[PDB]
Design a protein around this ligand. Structure first.
Ligand SMILES: Nc1ccn([C@H]2C[C@H](O)[C@@H](COP(=O)(O)OP(=O)(O)OP(=O)(O)O)O2)c(=O)n1
Ligand SMILES: [Mg+2]
Length: 342
DNA sequence: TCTAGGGTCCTAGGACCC
DNA sequence: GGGTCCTAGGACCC
């Protein structure tokens, strides 16, 4: 009664596209991210850069410290998007049960499938191959009875490899599996688990569920399940965004309400444009603004609202700026819309 | 080092509504 | 009182 799940993961996706398009960049440390002056962070880096310890989500500044000779790329969304579109069309040749997770990742459900005598291993290898023919990009993949295991498996032989976990293999695989490797277990959670002497799924199996629920709530349950290989989340494919936003971080903090109003005038047409594409009549459930301050704290202010409306966002922004800023500089401002259910 | 942008899901205080 | 809605913020993911 198993499922067969494949998680497909593009290797260094943005850097790979750049290396493909410009071969001079192959053997050198590169990164797609925003400049230090733009107060940017690294989206992604290729292997030569990763060797210096350069990482996704790393402040560009830390990345030039670790790797002085790093070449920084601003990124080309249209090139990445086109590639991602094509990859998803390839998946569709094998199955309709496709859940994209980002531009570079997707879960496939392949339980039903007559594609390679029902072999998930062979379907995975055939998708990676043919992503390579066609796009000249490599992918890694994981095959497992459930989602979170397929995802962890796609990391085990990257880049340009794959890894399979059979139902028989799950108990041995879990035993010494570090909880920090479970998706949704980030640094705060792992630190908290560690302070209780829980480092592996093995540790968590020896735990009482009620205690994990009382200490952690819903994540306590999820953790207790994942530690045991349990993950019933079905592959979706019918997933739609529930919200849409546009936000910008300025090169220099602002201290004047007119500066905030002016940035909002700039962000608004882009919000309108993006919302138009999924809802022409710009009707919505909530809209609101966000500000981030100099001490990196942020605040959001949204309210029930029938239709995307600029003057209301500006009015809301004035309130937020007058009441919550407390004299600080603002490094970021954003606009946000919550969509109507179904 | 000095911390994006665009999302999901989850919890929580307290107003609202029956 | 208890359910639901509204709102703001945290932790994560890519
Ligand atoms: N914090 C992040 C992480 C990633 N990305 C973007 C850049 C990547 O090219 C793409 C995929 O992200 P991953 O985090 O899966 O990393 P890569 O695909 O870059 O590398 P790997 O081969 O390690 O999966 O999404 C981003 O914008 N911000
Ligand atoms: Mg990836």
């Amino acid at each position: 009664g198993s499922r067969k799940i494949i998680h497909v993961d593009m290797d260094c996706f943005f850097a790979a596209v750049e290396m493909r398009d410009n071969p001079a960049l192959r053997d050198i440390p590169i990164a797609i991210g925003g400049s230090r002056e733009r107060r940017g962070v690294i989206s992604t880096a290729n292997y030569p850069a990763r060797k210096f310890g350069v990482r996704s989500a790393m402040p560009t500044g830390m990345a030039l410290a670790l790797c002085p000779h790093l070449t920084l790329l601003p990124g080309r969304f249209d090139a990445y998007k086109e590639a991602s579109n094509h990859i998803r069309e390839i998946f569709s040749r094998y199955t309709s049960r496709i859940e994209p997770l980002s531009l570079d990742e997707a879960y496939l459900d392949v339980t039903d499938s007559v594609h390679c005598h029902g072999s998930a291993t062979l379907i995975a290898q055939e998708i990676r191959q043919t992503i390579f023919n066609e796009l000249q990009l490599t992918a890694s993949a994981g095959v497992a009875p459930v989602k979170f295991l397929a995802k962890i498996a796609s990391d085990m032989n990257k880049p340009n490899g794959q890894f399979v976990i059979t139902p028989a293999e799950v108990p041995a695989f879990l035993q010494t599996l570090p909880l920090a490797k479970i998706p949704g277990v980030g640094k705060v959670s792992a630190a908290k688990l560690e302070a209780m002497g829980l480092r592996t799924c093995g540790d968590v199996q020896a735990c009482d569920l009620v205690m994990l629920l009382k200490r952690f709530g819903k994540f306590g349950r999820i953790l207790w399940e994942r530690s045991q290989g349990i993950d019933e989340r079905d592959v979706n494919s019918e997933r739609l965004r529930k919200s849409v936003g546009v936000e910008r971080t300025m090169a220099e903090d602002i201290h004047h309400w007119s500066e905030c109003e002016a940035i909002i005038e700039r962000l608004y047409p882009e919000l309108e444009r993006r919302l138009a594409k999924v809802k022409p009549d710009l009707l919505i459930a909530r809209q609101g603004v966000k500000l981030k301050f100099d001490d990196f704290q942020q605040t959001t202010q949204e309210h029930v609202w029938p239709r995307l409306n600029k003057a209301d966002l500006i009015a809301t922004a004035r309130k937020t700026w007058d009441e919550r800023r407390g004299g600080r500089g603002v490094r970021l401002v954003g606009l946000h819309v919550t969509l109507l259910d179904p």
